[PDB]
Amino acid sequence: KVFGRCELAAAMKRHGLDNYRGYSLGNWVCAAKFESNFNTQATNRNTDGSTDYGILQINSRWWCNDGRTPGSRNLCNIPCSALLSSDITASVNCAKKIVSDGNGMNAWVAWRNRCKGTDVQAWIRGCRL
Ligand SMILES: [Cl-]
Ligand SMILES: [Cl-]
Ligand SMILES: [Cl-]
Ligand SMILES: [Cl-]
Ligand code: NA
Fold it and tell me: What's the CATH number for 1-129?
């Protein structure tokens, strides 16, 4: 499913991502835009052999199991395919554990390079929340 900007913002707010660990809702919508283009079925291969999955491109090297990343961890205790669902519940709960691991939203390279230090509130402007 390809989410809409306000549709995703409302869905993320319902799952408690607004101001979660200090990151306003605009940060999560901005990151989802540049990580997956609002597409839940987005996948991308990394050089080390791991794969990024879902609306937030959560890495299989640490967070999910895809059966093809030897020596990796499954810290969110889920198959990586659950991150490709139209229900973002899995990706949000795993994102909450990622953003709490000490590095904040810097875990998402697209957020640090394209959202950090910008007016992220513009990503939720005009949305009914
Ligand atoms: Cl915001
Ligand atoms: Cl694996
Ligand atoms: Cl949903
Ligand atoms: Cl932080
Ligand atoms: Na894994």
Answer: 1.10.530.10
